[PDB]
Structure formats: C-alpha cells, structure tokens
Design a protein around this ligand. Sequence first.
Ligand code: NA
Ligand code: NA
Lengths: 294, 293
Amino acid sequence: NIHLIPYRVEQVTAAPPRIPEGVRMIQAPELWESAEHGKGNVVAVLDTGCQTDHPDLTARIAGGRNFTHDDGGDPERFEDYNGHGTHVAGTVAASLRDEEGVVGVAPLADLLVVKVLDKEGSGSYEGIIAGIHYAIDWRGPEGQKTTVISMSLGGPEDHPELYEAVKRAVDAGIPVICAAGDEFAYPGAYGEVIQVGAVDFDRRIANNEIDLVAPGINIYSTYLEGKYASLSGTSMATPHVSGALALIRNISEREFDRELTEAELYAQLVRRTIPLGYPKTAEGNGLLALDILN
Amino acid sequence: NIHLIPYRVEQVTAAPPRIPEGVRMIQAPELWESAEHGKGNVVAVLDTGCQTDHPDLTARIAGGRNFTHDDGGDPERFEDYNGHGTHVAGTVAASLRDEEGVVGVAPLADLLVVKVLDKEGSGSYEGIIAGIHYAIDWRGPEGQKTTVISMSLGGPEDHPELYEAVKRAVDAGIPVICAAGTDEFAYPGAYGEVIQVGAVDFDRRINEIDLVAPGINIYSTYLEGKYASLSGTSMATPHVSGALALIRNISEREFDRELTEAELYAQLVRRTIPLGYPKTAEGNGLLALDILN
Ligand code: NA
Ligand code: NA
C-alpha cells in the first residue's frame, strides 16, 4: 500500500495565522500581483480529501472525486476525516479574504480534491493510479483543467501503471510534485517527479533525490472543523512548491509569450531558488525563493 | 526540404586562437577541472559532416553515419565538403593540444558525426529523422552513448515523425539543441522539447528562445585542416551543446544521480545572466557557466 509521509500535529487553533510564515519565507506575496495570485490554475491534491466548506477553501474548490471506500464509495463525497488533505489544500491556495483566516501560496488558484487515502492516511496502488488518471483527465465547466499535481505520500515498490500515469501527466505538461520520505520511495523516485525536501524557518535541513527544499516545520494552514493547525514534517514543504508553480506558470507563460512545457516549468522553479550552503544531495537546487530574479 | 540556418564566413586562417573568446566568455575553462573537460560525453552533431582527420578533431571522433547523397550516399562516408559541420564540431570539442589549434567547450567529449546535410547545406526530413534515431540508438565500444544532440537547421513543415524523433531523444535523457532562425526554418526548433539558442556578440548585445550564447566572429576548425571565423545563431548553438557535457558531469556528481533531460535543461538555464532584453528576445539570458560563484 501507499501512505502519507509521517508528520506531527503541533497545535490546533481558531486563531487566524493571517499570512503564514512559510508563504512569506518563499516570497509568494512578492509575486501575487504579477501572477494574478495564481488565477487560471487547478492544483490536484491527491490526499485524504478536503473540508470543502471550510471558509478559507470553499471558493477554491473546483471539483473532486472520492476513490476510497469512505461514504459508501460514493465518488461525489470527498470530505476530509483525517485533516492532512485540508491542511495541504490551505497551503496551496487558501483564499485571500477580508475576514481573518489564512492565505495560501496561490490564493486565486483552484483545487481539485482527489481523495485517494483513508482516515489513517493509507491507500492502494490502484487508488493512487486512479487519482492520477482523474487528475489528468478531469475537465471543469469553463475550460478548467489540472495544471499541477501534488502528493505527500509514497509506497515502497514500483508499479508499471503508477509510472505510466506519472509519465502521462508530465507529457501533458503537468508537473507532478511529491514529498521526500525506503517505505515511501514511489512515486517520488521517478525521474519525472519533482521531489521536495524541507527546512525549518532557520533554513536548517530538517534514499532521497531532492530537487529543492521549502519550509516544513511549524506550518500553519487550514484544518478540520473550520479550524487551523500547525503541522511539521518533510511533506509540509510540498504544497508550498505546488502552489508556487501556479504563480510561476502564470508569470512565465506571459513573459515568454508561449505555453511552457513541463521541463520549462521545472526550470523556472529551480531558477527561483537560492543555495543554502549544503550539498546538493541534501538541498537539491536550494530553497524556494520566488522573488530572486528581481 | 531542410537547410542550414544562414550564417556568414568571415575569415579562413591557419593561425587561430588557442582559446576562442566564446569558449572563455561562457566560462567553460572555469568548469574544466571539475567536469574533467567533458569526458564521458558524446555530442551528436547533425550537420554537413566533419573533417574527421582534422588535427583538432581526429582524436574526438566516436563514429558517424551519412544520410545524404554526398559520396553517392555511402553511409560510411561522412566527411565535410561544406565546412559548417567541421566548425560546429570544433566549438563543441576541439582537443586541447600543446601544439597550436583551437580548443572547444568540452575538449574531452567525443563527437558523433551525423551527416544529415549535403555539401550545399540541404537535407530531407527523412534524413534528419533517421539521423536523430541513429544518434539515440548509437552505442560505443565500452557503452558510450549520445548525451547531447546538436542541430543548426530548419524547414517549414511539421512532420509528426520528426516531432516523435525529438520526443524520443528527450525521453531517452538527451537534450536536443537547435539554433534559432517567414517560417522557412521553423522546425524542429519550434517543438517545445527542443532547446532553441540565440546569439550575442562579445559586448553582450543581441522564435521561441531558451537562452543565448556567443555567435559573432566565432573561430573554430574548418576544412583542409584550417580554421575559420563564422557568425550566426548556429555558432551560438555548439557553445550550449558543449556546455551541456560539462554541466552533465558536474551535476550528476553533485546531485549523486543520473539527471533527466529536464534537469539538464534546468541546470543550463540556471547558469545564465540577464542582458536587459525581454525574455521573448534573450530567453533566460546569456550562458555564464560559473555565475553561481
Ligand atoms: Na482565507
Ligand atoms: Na586543438
């Protein structure tokens, strides 16, 4: 089976952490005007589902599907019972509201809730494969389609249909982002996948093949019951990268005046990093730093 | 039909520079020790052939094949009757010799001479397609393989077989480089997967451009064991192709893994500086291999 990369829940609160430090650390607000806050993107979150009426997320939900046995296996019921998927969603794209809540990296990007994990954070290879297929093929009512796939999970062994699905996504121009973890090797091990490691807010580094790092310690985002939670784990870094790609895609396609291939989106991501002074085996290309070219 | 991107021959000489300024400007010498001069790479040069007994190139030639009607179409005859292919080859990988001669960007990289253009610089779509597949499938005697494909050519027609050949190459981990150029040279440069290179002069002054490199008064090897200064986007292109051999070596060691084509491309465009032009004109900027220092 496949499982969430383990993480810790530090705190659950109703106190709004307005713009969380990780969003600020990677310099997302510095890109919001130029990137139209990520508008025109759909990030497919393959996870435990989402609280789709969370005030900070409700305007961002573009659609979703349930591939678990929760709720009788009803494909149209994809709410979150674990909390992790809701937290991911908020880092990617919690709305910018006048009311005090949180705000994500790409607050005008929308979310495709691809529920592939049970309440314990576990799923089958068949389920993750199905979720990737759906993420690629889904089409929303006004031309909407997935532009980034985000995963915080892994399984120990390869599967030909998992590889085929990942390759089909990148061949369609869709970056596939996965958290660094042997128990969680796949799909993060595939060459095509962008694998994300974590630092803390001191920029310290918290079997991997890292492409870059982002903040992963004491990350406040949305959580169950309309609340917020601070989570720590290697995988909290991944949604920062997935949301950032919505911003980077918007800016780069405008500046180059062309549709970008997945390889170009990857290159524009790693151009927006700073080295931290650690070996590339530990930090990859460095820390996500979105305003570095300015 | 496919043709060479137009260029100018400025001078032919038997008294060339030792290190051409374009090689210096992109900061290749700064990477030579760390990259072992590009050892462990084979750059497939898809062009007019090569003078394979040129003193600066003879120790670099890994092999080749002819897909043109030069020499009656003999596949094992791939010498250059034009000069352009020999010039490209020398910018990629002219050997570092004690005696005179020029030196390329990656002087221990080897060259696969994929002759797809005839003496006049012309070739068929079928021949370019066959040359790309040949480059992908070629294997050397100790398992060497093509690590970069380099082209300076174009035609107006979009043949799906040519797109598929380029896609096969990048999926095999091989960057495919083509010079930038009403659309008579559009393909294969226009395909999203191809890295398209524009040109600057040595004063940093200046399609779907990915980056730029020096392309004005570039000295390299030429016919009859001589040397020549040429100008054009097809002169910027081999600087990028040779640079990728250096980047591949350093990056695979530093990341401690084999890099995908997308990672090689990212490492290339990370090693640039902006020149103040729009990205539609300079792409990601000017190749500057040591800029991260
Ligand atoms: Na909000
Ligand atoms: Na030489």
